[PDB]
């Protein structure tokens, strides 16, 4: 997030980090319940990658984070990688996340929900802060 | 990338106003936000774009793409969850 700002530790309890087995953060994601994570289809997640919940400072060893494994990767069949349309993948955890103060679910809207232009929303992530 | 989790407020745009920046690349399962001095960037993909609706944070978009340079004056493009939620519902029920 270019020009973003540091979040309050644990205030975005659904934010997860997709890391390869090397420990390298490559994508973000959101928990929609204890067994499923929603992420982008472009991320190219495989079952060797790990979902880390409860994390704030990727460079700390004292955090009580949860490294969860992926059972199956569900790439939306409507996903078009040439237009980058329908960019959503569901990840089923082989080991369910344990919900607490720093780990919980984000709500999903109804297909009929309206979010008008001009509305201020928030986006979070560990992506580049300067390019 | 940064060690600590970052956040940023940003405005949703109309798909019409976004087509001014992106023309025909803006499809129906896409929603725009930003062009306000902040931008999602590499490493942010898959992450959430949340809006507070009736007291709770609900998932409106998924970081998908945008300016290759992460220009804070160009709007970012997110997967429109409202157009994909029926598939999520189907998937969670079958599996």
């Amino acid at each position: 997030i270019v020009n973003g700002e540091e979040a309050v530790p644990g205030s975005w309890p659904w934010q997860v980090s997709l890391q390869d087995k090397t420990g390298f953060h490559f994508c973000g994601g959101s928990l929609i319940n204890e067994n499923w994570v929603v992420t982008a289809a472009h991320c190219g997640v495989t079952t060797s990658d790990v979902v880390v919940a409860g994390e704030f400072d990727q460079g700390s060893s004292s955090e009580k984070i949860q490294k969860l494994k992926i059972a199956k990767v569900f790439k939306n069949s409507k996903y078009n990688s040439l237009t980058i349309n329908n960019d959503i993948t569901l990840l089923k955890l082989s080991t369910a996340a344990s919900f607490s103060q720093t780990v919980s679910a984000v709500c999903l809207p109804s297909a009929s929900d309206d979010f008008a232009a001009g509305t201020t929303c928030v986006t979070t992530g560990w992506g580049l802060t300067r390019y | 990338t940064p060690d600590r989790l970052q956040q940023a407020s940003l405005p949703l745009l109309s798909n019409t106003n976004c087509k001014k920046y992106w023309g025909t690349k803006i499809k129906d399962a896409m929603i725009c936000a930003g062009a306000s001095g902040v931008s999602s960037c590499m490493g942010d993909s898959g992450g959430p774009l949340v809006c507070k609706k009736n007291g709770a944070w609900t998932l409106v978009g998924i970081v998908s793409w945008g300016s290759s340079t992460c220009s804070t004056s160009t709007p970012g493009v997110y997967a429109r969850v409202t157009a994909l939620v029926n598939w999520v519902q189907q998937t969670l029920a079958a599996n």
Binding site: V8, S11, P13, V106 | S9, V50, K52, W57
Partner: peptide
Amino acid sequence: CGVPAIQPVL
């Protein structure tokens, strides 16, 4: 859902 235990500060 969508209501964190630790409130975000914007």
